[PDB]
Write a protein that binds this ligand. Structure first.
Ligand SMILES: C[C@@]1(CC(=O)O)c2cc3[nH]c(cc4nc(cc5[nH]c(cc(n2)[C@H]1CCC(=O)O)[C@@](C)(CC(=O)O)[C@@H]5CCC(=O)O)C(CC(=O)O)=C4CCC(=O)O)c(CCC(=O)O)c3CC(=O)O
Ligand SMILES: Nc1ncnc2c1ncn2[C@@H]1O[C@H](CSCC[C@H](N)C(=O)O)[C@@H](O)[C@H]1O
Ligand SMILES: Nc1ncnc2c1ncn2[C@@H]1O[C@H](CSCC[C@H](N)C(=O)O)[C@@H](O)[C@H]1O
Ligand SMILES: [Cl-]
Ligand SMILES: [Cl-]
Lengths: 451, 449
């Protein structure tokens, strides 16, 4: 984070503006609306300032900068056209540990003032750190269109109900569930906007009267292969409302940042699968809303079935949000479609890491007109090469390995089947092996990166 | 207003957190991300704090709150479970004019913490003034889905490019039109994030070379199998920026409802259309300078002919990209309670299409999950051939019609019933064959129709 956004309570707190022109006037108006106890220190003032001072709304100090005016201050704003003066102000503020904005130099000093979308008491602040005023304006335009004008009345009414919600629901889990219903009842929002107090009260009474599900919940969510843009809308929804998220190392850091910030997080793996099952079950038996966040898709070599197979008998509600499997993401981001024209009748998603005595069906895998995708197969790439050749696959069949597919770190190496063992030495886990004529299309379809 | 939002520069500035449990750890994570020179003071610390301390990321002071720890501090956060301690911290900070937050307390705080959407240098913060923390979270979720992951990359790159923008643009009206195209170029942002200097330089020169009104590109977007919640975040972001959306019947109405109202729409599906005509539409519209989204059911590269649509473009000089989607196999699997793999049931999953002809001995072999796309008409033949090439007659089979939608229909039985079960469903439907079908009785959670 370049900056930390905070929302300050300035009511009755001393603040100082140095400067007295149009810039100072805009900042002073903002600080006055926030209730600051404002002093303005400038050599000259535009007329808006003199009337403010006579009607008692702020104090004017007409003259050069007096750094002792910072002594009682919580915030300072340097708003002159003299960079020498502005720097004296910022230096004096920094020595007193007073957050200071230099209006014409956002990279100097110690805070910047964001653009504000006002749905009071709801506020949304936007800034690009001065690097890009256009982008901030384009975002502000877009945010103003997304936020209904009546949102403020919903937030206002919620604040008025917080005491009643605290009294009537004994646990935070119940309170949270009430609010999640409250904030999406469109009728309630309309009635507030119409000041229809009878209608507001009717829907409110009913919301308070509803029995709340105290049962837990286990949702398996497919994180996808790494690019946080490949999480589904519903997957984002589920992790944003989870009490606890049980996640593995194949879930990318970018995706974990999208988890509800107050959710508890439990890491598994690098842990035996039976202990994962117990965690999910036990945490849901406590009434908690559990998300098992899994790399790729939960039902393709993810053991997702094992994690749910006890829950029905145990009376635990569950659901599954599918994800982009490694095969799909790596295909798209390497320029290798899994199917194309008559290249492949079928796609085979194969595990390269099989049970101790198990052996893959090589005669079956080596058949023509298919795209083979090996998961967890790096260690066996030499055997895969030898077996596919022995069961009739052409030696010049193209192969590709995709390492960290869809991430900014993705790497792709490629060649023909007789190089598979050598090529696999050039990558590490997590990596996918693609075998089939579609690999040759990468020269025409690669769009994501050359690395 | 009742609170003034400011964006604080905390890099190497002394900040104090009082508390050492889960609540304090969340605040410490936030202040560390902002670069704060952080001290944490608590009667005891959970293990995350000692880990951080050993890696030199912060300083720990084990013991009761000592208000002299505030003497050089710019921000304070009271994050204990003891109201008396938190009030001592808040009073000590206020007497020093140090903005102070008390977590899970509205007043006695001189600042409150908003929900944060980080695209640094770009940042968005949402606050309801203490009235509605859940509303702030819900708005964060909405904004996180809408702001592309790498927007901060272009925001930073804008700097080293303003000398060139004004040497080529003298009017104020044109400069904004350039930036408007620049900041929505998600390809450039990803290439910057990829550290792909070759791609960055190529995309940059095109931004200056082409006319202002030209924004030609094609994005293949996987709509998923129907449920609008199964669109990816990037898929949503792309359809929100499209000049024109080209779609067909297997893109659900729910997904099309997310299409930016205003976008020109071209329907290429079944009514009462050769692929070449579709390829040319994408080509022609891209060359007219339009940002074109080709929305496809499921995933574009799994029986979607997405490759055919793109090879038209690579040698026409038209930039393109692909957003994968949830394929029908994955969506139907999740929503029917039939995992495609499970324990040792299946060593492989086969996604298969219903000149040429299928290899039946291959398809009949054990330890597979078969998923037939577009096979509804051949379902009687699939039954006969799988039986005749040795698949067990008692093998479970299922058909999923309109998978993931509110009208999803799942019928199931055994291989000898496949032809008759297929009469009970309509396209689009998936046929699933394999031992995993038997898990539906334990795992079906979605309503059947
Ligand atoms: C005043 C404020 C404190 C301050 O910062 O000064 C406040 C106060 C309280 N929160 C409480 C509980 C919850 N807090 C959250 C979530 C968030 N709380 C946040 C900030 C704020 N919380 C401040 C201003 C809020 C505003 O602007 O409207 C967020 C946005 C920012 C952050 O903290 O990081 C963060 C989401 C971050 C993200 O996910 O993006 C949830 C929901 C959830 O967990 O999903 C719940 C449960 C549901 C509910 O109770 O509503 C309680 C009752 C405790 C109890 O029951 O005893 C109080 C006390 C009270 O005021 O009643
Ligand atoms: N980003 C990535 N790039 C390449 N391969 C990946 C990958 N993420 C997962 N994999 C593959 O997936 C294997 C783990 S098995 C779990 C796969 C996951 N359920 C899915 O649907 O994709 C790894 O060994 C690797 O072969
Ligand atoms: N919602 C759905 N439910 C069941 N099958 C579906 C489906 N959507 C698409 N299909 C299957 O896909 C076939 C069209 S081929 C298109 C496949 C798409 N690219 C994907 O990845 O899913 C249909 O005949 C049907 O078998
Ligand atoms: Cl599995
Ligand atoms: Cl071959």
């Amino acid at each position: 984070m370049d900056h930390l956004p905070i929302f300050c309570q300035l009511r009755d707190r001393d603040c100082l503006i140095v400067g007295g022109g149009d810039v100072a006037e805009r900042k002073a108006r903002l600080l006055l609306e926030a209730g600051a106890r404002l002093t303005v220190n400038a050599l000259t003032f535009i007329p808006q300032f003199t009337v403010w001072a006579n009607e008692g709304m702020l104090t004017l100090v007409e003259g050069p900068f007096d750094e002792t005016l910072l002594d009682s201050c919580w915030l300072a704003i340097a708003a002159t056209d003299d960079d020498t003066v502005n720097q004296r102000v910022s230096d004096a503020a920094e020595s007193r540990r007073i957050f200071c904005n230099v209006v014409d130099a956002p990279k100097a000093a110690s805070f910047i003032m964001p653009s504000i979308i006002d749905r009071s008491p709801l506020m949304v602040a936007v800034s690009a750190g001065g690097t890009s005023p256009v982008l901030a304006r384009l975002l502000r335009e877009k945010l103003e269109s997304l936020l209904p004008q009546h949102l403020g009345q919903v937030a206002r009414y919620a604040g008025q109900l917080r005491a009643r919600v605290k009294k009537q629901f004994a646990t935070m889990g119940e309170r949270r569930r009430f609010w999640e219903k409250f904030f999406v009842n469109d009728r309630l929002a309309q009635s507030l906007a119409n000041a229809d107090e009878k209608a507001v009260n009717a829907t409110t009474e009913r919301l308070f009267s509803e029995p709340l599900d105290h049962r837990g919940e286990v949702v398996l969510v497919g994180a996808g292969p790494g690019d946080a843009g490949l999480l589904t809308l519903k997957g984002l929804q589920q992790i944003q409302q989870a009490d606890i998220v049980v996640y593995d190392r194949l879930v990318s850091d970018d995706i974990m940042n999208l988890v509800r910030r107050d959710a508890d997080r439990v890491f598994v793996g690098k842990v035996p699968q039976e202990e994962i099952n117990q965690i999910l079950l036990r945490e849901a038996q406590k009434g908690k809303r559990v998300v098992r966040l899994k790399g790729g898709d939960p039902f393709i070599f993810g053991r997702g079935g094992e994690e749910l197979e006890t829950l029905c008998h145990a009376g635990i509600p569950f659901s599954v949000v599918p994800g982009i499997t490694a095969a799909s993401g790596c295909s798209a981001y390497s320029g290798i479609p899994l199917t194309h024209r008559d290249y492949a009748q079928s796609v085979r998603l194969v595990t390269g890491h099989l049970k101790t005595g198990g052996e893959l069906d090589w005669e079956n895998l080596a058949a023509e007109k298919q795209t083979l995708v090996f998961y967890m197969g790096l260690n066996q790439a030499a055997t895969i090469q030898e077996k596919l050749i022995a069961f009739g696959m052409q030696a010049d069949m193209p192969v590709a390995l995709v390492e960290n597919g869809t991430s900014v770190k993705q790497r792709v190496v490629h060649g023909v089947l007789t190089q598979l063992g050598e090529l696999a030495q050039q990558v590490e886990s997590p990596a996918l092996i693609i075998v089939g004529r579609v690999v040759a299309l990468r020269d025409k379809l690669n769009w994501f990166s050359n690395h």
